[PDB]
Ligand binder design. Structure first.
Ligand SMILES: N=C(N)c1ccc(CNC(=O)[C@@H]2C=CCN2C(=O)[C@@H](CC2CCCCC2)NCC(=O)O)cn1
Lengths: 34, 250
């Protein structure tokens, strides 16, 4: 939509359900902790 | 980047290096937002106090990189600039307000495992993700300390800081078009962007659709990773309309 389709989905990670070493540190902060 | 660590392969496929033709050196960071457009900080191109004022032909855009100095044959893609657009109201004279610029590539770049565009935030996404305490990611090949350089692309995860706290850390006049990020003195952890990271992307991964969005652009700071001070970034969404305006017309 407000951004071309497919954008933001990394070939070597999201597209293969693979996580990078520290992305969970980010998602864990989108709640209340840090 | 100070106190960060080596990024892994294909971790930031939108990461762009602004390379100078002569001499040949790292100039700034930038980001790929489509097959023909790259985003960066205006002070990277224009900054009179330092007689800095580059044009289309003084620069090269290098996409898909990991190593700072090597020419990554078969992996990276070097592209030329067709046109540069600085924000008409970029304030280099006072506080670097509206530190943003768009660059039009001469020819579309072909995506791959190492080259892929990041997403631009929309009102909803920015509203939900841009909050104090939430962490974003900054990447670059800039300095490792205030006063050498990394061998490989560096990455750091930093929390966004409360606007009031940003205002009381500097004598510089803050504006709505910027936000600051970093750890406070008593938070144990540290880290920050630094000279050479300018124009680099500050991104966040949406918990809703799993996509990575670019919320900021490495803009300025006073020193690097000093206690009590924070890094400032251009508020990408606040300037989103200037962006679409430019892309839809040019
Ligand atoms: N620690 C950080 N987060 C950081 C440090 C430096 C840079 C590169 N950006 C700059 O160098 C810009 C370009 C014009 C000057 N500038 C600054 O950051 C000035 C502050 C400017 C604030 C706006 C008005 C002009 C001075 N400080 C340099 C320093 O102390 O190391 C980016 N981030």
């Amino acid at each position: 939509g407000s951004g071309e389709a497919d954008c933001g989905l990394r070939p070597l990670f999201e597209k293969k359900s693979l996580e990078d070493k520290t992305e969970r540190e980010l998602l864990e902060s989108y709640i209340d902790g840090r | 980047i100070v106190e960060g660590s080596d990024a892994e392969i294909g971790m930031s496929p939108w990461q762009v290096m602004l390379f100078r033709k002569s001499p040949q050196e790292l100039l700034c960071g930038a980001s790929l937002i489509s097959d023909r457009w790259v985003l960066t900080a205006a002070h990277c191109l224009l900054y009179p106090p330092w007689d800095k004022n580059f044009t289309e032909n003084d620069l090269l855009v290098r996409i898909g990189k990991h190593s700072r100095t090597r020419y990554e044959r078969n992996i990276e893609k070097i592209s030329m600039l067709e046109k540069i657009y600085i924000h008409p109201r970029y304030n280099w004279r006072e506080n670097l307000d509206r530190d943003i610029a768009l660059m039009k590539l001469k020819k579309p770049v072909a995506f791959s495992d190492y080259i892929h565009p990041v997403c631009l935030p929309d009102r909803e996404t920015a509203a939900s993700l841009l909050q104090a305490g939430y962490k974003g990611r900054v990447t670059g090949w800039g300095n490792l300390k205030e006063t050498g350089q990394p061998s490989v692309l560096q990455v750091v995860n930093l929390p966004i800081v409360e606007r009031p706290v940003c205002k009381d850390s500097t004598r510089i006049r803050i504006t709505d078009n910027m936000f600051c990020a970093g750890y406070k003195p008593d938070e144990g952890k540290r880290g920050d962007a630094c000279e050479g990271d300018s124009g680099g992307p500050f991104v966040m991964k949406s918990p809703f659709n799993n996509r990575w969005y670019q919320m900021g652009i490495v803009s300025w700071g006073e020193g690097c990773d000093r206690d009590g001070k924070y890094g400032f970034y251009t508020h990408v969404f606040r300037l989103k309309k200037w962006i679409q305006k430019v892309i839809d017309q040019f």
